[PDB]
């Protein structure tokens, strides 16, 4: 139903082939910018693989939502040499963490009993809060209806909201009527009931408050020993109530292109205490991509632990992190889930974070594209690309430190491909990337650079425009004018000057 801004979560797609003829099939995830997902604005995360008959295959997709509200997730999949194909866009709810809470207040309106000159001034101070979450939703429905006799109530409703206040009339014609008016900001309310009859006002308010992963301790580790390629999976867990956890469930996703070792899996299956659904075996591999493991109990005492071998088929593409999920029968809202990846400690896929604001990362580092002789037609093909919002030339002022994120501060010089920024050279630019990429980018102070990335990688900052350097934002050394005379360089001096003049002063070929 919901996930939250900047959580790492696995969504689990199932693929069904209700046919015969075993099939080879291809499953692409899509790229959507509101997500740090396996996929990138250029290369979609795809897997090709096979599935039996009447048969079914779990495909995990790991993702961190970033922007919140509703956002589309799209999976598509096609069967090799055949009609069969299918896609799915399902919208997904990203919310700010914190829980829903309702505070109701109820005033009586009785101008005859309470008001001054038949005129009753009722005000409701904005109800105090702040077990709240900042800049979160707040929904107050205000709700009057007259009490039944001969009543007649003129009624006023005023908020800072606007100046032109609302006014309702109530009499015997509509005493029993819904007099609702809502506002999405709690603030002092000003009802003025001037009349005679009686009436009920209910101010109903809603907002999010708060105080992940209890119930179970859970380590998960993984790493090699050599045989197509191989590695070891180790899962550790422990209830912590006062007594052994009854009937628990261990949930596992396989890293992309990975399968559980038939042998080992069988070695666990033997038990009056551990059970695994029947599962196909081929070349000593089990055909679950998602293996669930039902056990009879789990100590609150000692770390109960188990392990199995996991093997590879094709080294294909990125290797998507894997999920492990503990949950007790008596507690099926157990959100105790954790990730693993051979070379990722936490297993949480790369992202960059400042404040609330989060953005992608490519996971794979980004090298500063080096090249001596530049093909001007080609280069202009590259830089003249659907997914390239802008091409600047630009001198790198400061290099600064912020939360393991380097901010290479840039000032913009020439504007080749005009960005979306109405005026780049105006306000300085902040090009941010993780420490990990320090040496492979290898920037230096006071050098010039042809940089060109995509708008996709912007990062809403406080009155300073910043991008994040990606396996998609391209930077290059623009040899300085002096350096010009040199041998290592005259050539680049030229190629550039000409590519520059060319792009900056004429569109894109096609």
């Amino acid at each position: 139903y919901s996930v939250v801004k900047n959580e790492q979560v696995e969504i689990r797609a199932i693929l069904h082939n209700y046919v015969n003829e075993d099939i080879y099939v291809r499953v692409e995830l899509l790229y959507n910018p509101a997500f740090c997902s396996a996929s990138t604005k250029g290369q979609r995360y795809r897997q090709q693989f096979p599935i039996k008959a009447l048969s079914s295959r779990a495909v995990p997709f790991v993702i961190v939502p970033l922007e919140q509200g509703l956002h589309d997730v799209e999976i598509k999949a096609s069967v090799q040499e055949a009609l069969w194909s299918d896609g799915v866009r399902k919208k997904l709810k990203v919310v700010p963490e914190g829980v829903q809470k309702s505070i109701v207040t109820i005033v009586k309106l009785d101008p005859r009993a309470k008001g001054v000159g038949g005129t009753q001034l009722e005000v409701i101070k904005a109800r105090k809060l702040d077990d709240r979450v900042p800049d979160t939703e707040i929904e107050t429905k205000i709700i009057i209806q007259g009490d039944p006799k001969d009543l007649n109530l003129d009624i006023t409703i005023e908020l800072p909201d606007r100046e032109v206040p609302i006014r309702y009339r109530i009499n015997y014609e509509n005493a029993l009527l819904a007099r609702t008016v809502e506002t999405k900001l709690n603030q002092d309310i000003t009802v003025t009931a001037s009349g005679d009859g009686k009436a009920t006002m209910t101010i109903l308010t809603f907002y999010n408050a708060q105080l992940v992963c209890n119930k179970f301790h859970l380590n998960v580790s993984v790493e090699n020993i050599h045989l197509k390629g191989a590695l070891m999976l180790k899962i550790c867990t422990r209830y912590l109530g006062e007594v052994d956890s009854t009937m628990t469930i261990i949930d596992i996703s396989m890293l992309t292109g990975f399968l559980p070792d038939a042998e080992d899996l069988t070695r666990l299956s033997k038990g009056v205490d551990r059970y695994i659904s029947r599962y196909e075996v081929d070349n000593n591999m089990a055909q679950k991509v998602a293996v669930i493991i039902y056990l009879n109990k789990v100590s609150h005492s000692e770390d109960e632990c188990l392990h199995f071998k996991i093997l590879k088929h094709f080294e294909v593409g990125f290797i998507q992190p894997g999920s492990v999920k503990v949950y007790s029968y008596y507690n099926l809202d157990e959100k105790c889930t954790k990730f693993y990846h051979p070379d990722k400690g936490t297993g949480l896929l790369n992202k960059i974070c400042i404040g609330n604001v989060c953005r992608c990362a490519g996971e794979t580092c980004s090298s500063l594209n080096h090249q001596e002789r530049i093909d001007v037609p080609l280069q202009i093909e590259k830089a003249c690309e659907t997914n390239v919002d802008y091409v600047y030339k630009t001198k790198l002022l400061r290099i600064e430190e912020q939360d393991g994120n380097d901010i290479y501060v840039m000032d913009v010089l020439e504007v080749i491909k005009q960005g979306t920024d109405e005026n780049p050279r105006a306000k300085t630019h902040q090009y941010i990337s993780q420490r990990k990429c320090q040496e492979a980018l290898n920037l230096k102070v006071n050098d010039d650079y042809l940089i060109w990335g995509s708008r996709s990688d912007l990062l809403p900052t406080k009155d300073k425009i910043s991008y994040i350097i990606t396996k998609n934002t391209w930077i290059e050394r623009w040899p300085h004018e002096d350096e010009c005379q040199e041998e290592e360089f005259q050539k680049l001096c030229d190629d550039f000057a000409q590519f520059s003049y060319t792009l900056t002063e004429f569109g894109c070929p096609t």
């Binding site: 080879y24 099939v25 291809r26 692409e28 090709q48 799209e74 999976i75 598509k76 096609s78 069967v79 090799q80 040499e81 194909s85 299918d86 896609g87 799915v88 866009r89 399902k90």
Partner: peptide, 23 residues
């Protein structure tokens, strides 16, 4: 590659109410 169907031609399923055709 080339063993499948063209994304441009695959049209995702996108509409899933729970109750419709209120007539």
């Amino acid at each position: 590659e080339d063993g499948f169907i063209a994304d441009s031609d695959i049209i995702s399923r996108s509409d899933f109410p729970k109750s419709w055709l209120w007539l």
